[PDB]
């Protein structure tokens, strides 16, 4: 129902909890709600 | 300013890493992700990664004025119980993990 | 039931429709400006102009709700009409729109007034807020047309136009409800929705089904228009918006509520409270209001699967843009529910909205469409593809007695002016109406013949209320006729239309017969060249007087010119081109620049875009009213355009050709054209 | 026909709609408190 | 002087009509608990 | 029918309760008068 629809969605929990992240402080670097700042490298890797 | 002064010191030492690790990795491609734009607007490439991981499926991510975390997820994720794999919901198609 | 959630009550004042709570409301169907013809600076003052009057009567109570609808037109009827030619043409047509758009745009702001013995002055004081405020809005939107629904008689028992709006917003389908004693919502919704168990998507009976994006940008907006790339699509759909404006002390707490919990957090981000701190000292300097919005698209697909698959294709239309598409697999009902206006409570997800990302995500621009239906005479006389691949829904009675009926057509002969002046006249025969027709050339004289009527060309060797008669006559020694015969009729200019002064006497004796004879019954005059009669001394000052009955009347003077600089827009000239409802401007290689925009009033950027069509491109520019698109009526294989069009264009050995097999036939059911048919391309080969 | 002379007092309809209803919950809460107060008595009579 | 981002909310979001009515039930609960405090009282006399 | 066939309904329906609730008080209060008498 309309009513149960809006109850039930109240109940539900967000996945916003399980994802720790935040404003680019820098162009290359990204925040953390925990303050634990990242970067991540694109590797093309060694032939083997 | 103190948090200011944890963002500076983090930021220079995360630099310094990433200067030092592009310059060990020579001989691997050795490409930084960082911010690309797109159309008058600012989008996020490293956003993109971080979204194929938790969407499964590579969506451009723009950067706007709210929080990375709240817009980040697209794709209903639906872990099983009592079960080994997982179901995600989403308009393209429905991935199971 | 679902009474529950529409909350209309009952109609007041005959243009505000009351509510539970005691929320008079108010309709207005927009048509949006041209966004594709104005050029940049265009659009920010519009921005700028609706801004004004949005903060000038700015107050708690307002509320806006803005709705586009993508409506597959089926009040198109395809009419029937007897003559030949005309339904060769018509249907053949008919047949090059397959697989083209026939989704046409329609844009409606609903303003809504809630208040936060003497009940009876303050019902009063409460009605006028409403009047005031519509008042208002209408002297604003004086530029881009805006039809205050209301009320209309029929047959002894009134409908509110207002509730059929509502009504198509919850229906989907445009139902004709009546003004009875009961409360509107209780028999409103004749088409109940229903929704999915678990609500991924909805599903409502004529079977359509819906499925709804959430939209919601929390940042300023780029550009002015950000949601024109839906404009054009492969799905109906809705798309909505409300705003309701926070009074400036709200404002300034919940500025100040964020800014602290922006402060308030492990990692600084210097960028995002710097510009917050900004935007609230924007906010008592830069005068604009905010309030709480949120935005909802309902696309319609047949299957699950297409909805699916539209879904998809507008998240990535608007990824194009740096907007991101929150899918909704839950809280649909919510969402849908809120759609109606008034409905504050379902709004799945408020957010605090500047009122100029506000305008920017929802300006009235929408494609040049018409109105199908509903004209004076009928349905729409015809329609023509447009570049940007939209439909237009041509009429000749717009305007700003009668609407306007009067058409200018600018361009040279040669550039087109021959296959659209006879495809116009072709299918304004499905009215029927009386034709009188004046060609510089023989051209006319070919399509003419194609038609019920037979033209009357003039040639060497065969010419009480009548004291006017008589008094005219005078004016001249100072230097079949009927419309019984049949109903359709043309005479030659070719003849005087060099000559210094042989003209005016003769067009002072023809419009006496020709206004006479039907005299209210149906005109839609047709000059090639409305320049050379007007230069008499007696004839520009009748129809000066008289162009107001003869409005009054059917009567509608399809006025062309091959040069409007040659026109030259003399004194008494100037009240003929400027009553002109509807201007079709054709490609002119050669314009005067000063004389063309001044003369028009043509904008610069739309004078931009008739240069652009250049010389020999078969396009032209339609500006109805205030608005303006780059329709082509190009005749292409997908295969009798050859053939229509080569009946349709007038040459002298084409019309020496017409006169001699008309004169020999005697009994032909216009089966002359299948000799004409190859009699001409023979030659030119 | 007179059309809106109809509608004309569905206006004043709602009015006193409102007055009316507004009117029963002040007397709902004069009964109510007046039952509480009275019930009061009878209770710590009954005591 | 609304003075408040939540006030405003609620009095976007409440239902005035419905309000009163879920006044009047609960008017009528608590004098329907006032009968029952007074039949206890009537019993504990006799 | 409308909104006055509603204003006219509770205009009664709470008549209803009204008699009621005084009913009620009227058969209690004798009550009381009538034991204790």
């Not at chain 3, 039931?1 to 529409?6: A, D, S």
């Not at chain 4, 007092?9 to 409102?18: A, K, V």
Request: with cysteine; hydrophobic share 40%.
């Amino acid at each position: 129902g309309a009513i149960e629809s809006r109850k039930l969605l109240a109940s539900e929990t967000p996945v916003g909890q399980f994802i720790p992240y935040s404003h680019h402080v820098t162009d290359t670097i990204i925040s953390t709600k925990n303050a634990e700042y990242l970067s991540v490298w694109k590797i093309d890797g060694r032939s083997h | 300013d103190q948090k200011k002064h944890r963002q500076e010191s983090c930021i220079k030492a995360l630099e310094d890493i990433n200067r030092t690790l592009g310059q060990s990795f020579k001989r691997y491609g050795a490409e930084l992700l960082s911010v690309y734009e797109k159309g008058g607007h600012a989008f996020s490439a490293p956003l993109e990664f971080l979204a194929r991981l938790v969407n499964g499926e590579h969506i451009p991510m723009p950067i706007c004025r709210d929080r990375f975390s709240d817009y980040m997820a697209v794709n209903r994720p639906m872990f099983s119980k009592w079960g080994e794999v997982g179901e995600l919901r989403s308009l393209t198609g429905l991935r199971r993990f | 039931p679902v009474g529950q959630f529409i909350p209309y009550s009952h109609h007041v004042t005959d243009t505000i429709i009351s509510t539970k709570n005691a929320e008079y409301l108010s309709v207005w169907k927009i048509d949006g400006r041209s966004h594709q013809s104005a050029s940049e600076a265009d659009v920010f003052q519009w921005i700028r102009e609706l801004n004004n009057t949005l903060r000038g009567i700015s107050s708690a109570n307002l509320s806006l709700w803005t709705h586009i609808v993508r409506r597959r037109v089926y009040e198109y009827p395809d009419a029937e009409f007897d003559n030949v030619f005309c339904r060769q043409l018509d249907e053949k047509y008919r047949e090059s729109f397959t697989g083209y758009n026939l989704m046409v745009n329609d844009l409606y702001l609903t303003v809504v007034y809630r208040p936060v013995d003497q009940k009876k002055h303050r019902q009063e004081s409460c009605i006028k807020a409403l009047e005031d405020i519509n008042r208002t809005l209408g002297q604003s939107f004086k530029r881009y047309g805006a039809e205050l629904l209301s009320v209309y008689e029929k047959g002894g028992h009134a409908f509110s136009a207002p509730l059929e709006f509502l009504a198509r917003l919850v229906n989907g389908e445009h139902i004709p409800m009546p003004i009875c004693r009961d409360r509107f919502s209780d028999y409103m919704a004749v088409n109940r929705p229903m929704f999915s168990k678990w609500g991924e998507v909805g599903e409502l009976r004529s079977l359509r089904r819906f499925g709804m994006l959430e939209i919601r940008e929390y940042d300023d907006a780029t550009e002015p228009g950000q949601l024109n790339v839906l404009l054009e699509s492969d799905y109906e759909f809705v798309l909505t918006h409300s705003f309701s404006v926070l009074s400036r002390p709200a404002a300034k707490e919940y500025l100040q509520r964020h800014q602290k919990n922006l402060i308030d957090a492990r990692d600084v981000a210097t960028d995002q409270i710097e510009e917050i701190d900004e935007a609230l000292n924007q906010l008592i300097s830069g005068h604009f209001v905010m309030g709480e919005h949120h935005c909802t698209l309902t696309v319609y697909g047949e299957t699950v699967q297409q909805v699916r698959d539209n879904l998809a294709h507008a998240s990535a239309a608007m990824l194009d843009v740096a907007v991101l598409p929150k899918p909704v697999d839950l809280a649909l009902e919510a969402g849908y529910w809120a759609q109606l206006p008034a409905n504050w409570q379902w709004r799945p997800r408020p957010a605090p909205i500047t009122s100029l990302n506000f305008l920017s995500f929802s300006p009235f621009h929408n494609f040049m469409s018409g109105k199908p239906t509903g004209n004076p005479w009928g349905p729409a006389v015809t329609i023509l593809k447009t570049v940007s691949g939209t439909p237009l829904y041509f009429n000749f009675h717009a305007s700003k007695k009668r609407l306007l009926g009067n058409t200018m057509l600018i361009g040279q002969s040669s550039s087109g002016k021959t296959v659209l002046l006879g495809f116009l006249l072709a299918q304004a025969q499905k009215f029927k109406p009386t034709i009188v027709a004046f060609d510089k050339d023989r051209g006319m004289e070919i399509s003419i013949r194609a038609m019920g009527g037979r033209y009357l060309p003039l040639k060497t060797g065969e010419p009480h209320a009548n004291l006017i008669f008589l008094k005219q006559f005078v004016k001249k020694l100072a230097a079949a006729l009927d419309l019984s015969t049949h109903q359709i009729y043309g005479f030659d200019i070719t003849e005087f239309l060099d000559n210094p002064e042989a003209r005016t006497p003769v067009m002072m004796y023809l419009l006496y017969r020709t206004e006479s004879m039907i005299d209210g019954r149906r005109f839609m005059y047709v000059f090639d060249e409305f320049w050379k009669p007007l230069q008499d001394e007696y004839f520009e000052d009748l129809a000066k007087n008289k162009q107001k009955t003869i409005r009054k009347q059917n009567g509608i003077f399809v006025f062309a010119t091959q040069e409007p600089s040659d026109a030259l827009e003399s004194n008494i000239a100037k009240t003929l081109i400027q009553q002109c409802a509807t201007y079709i401007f054709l490609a002119n290689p050669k314009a005067d620049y000063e004389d063309y925009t001044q003369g028009f009033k043509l904008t610069d950027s739309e004078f931009e875009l008739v240069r652009g069509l250049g010389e020999f491109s078969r396009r032209f520019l339609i500006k109805q009213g205030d608005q303006s698109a780059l329709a082509e009526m190009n005749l292409g294989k997908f295969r009798d355009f050859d053939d229509e069009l080569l009946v349709l264009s007038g040459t002298p050995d084409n019309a020496e050709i017409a006169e001699s097999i008309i004169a020999e036939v005697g009994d032909d059911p216009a089966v002359w054209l299948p000799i004409f048919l190859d009699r001409v391309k023979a030659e030119r080969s | 026909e007179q059309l809106k002379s109809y509608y004309e007092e569905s206006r004043g309809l709602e009015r006193d709609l409102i007055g009316e209803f507004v009117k029963s919950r002040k007397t709902a809460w004069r009964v109510a408190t007046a039952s509480g107060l009275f019930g009061l008595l009878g209770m710590v009579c009954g005591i």
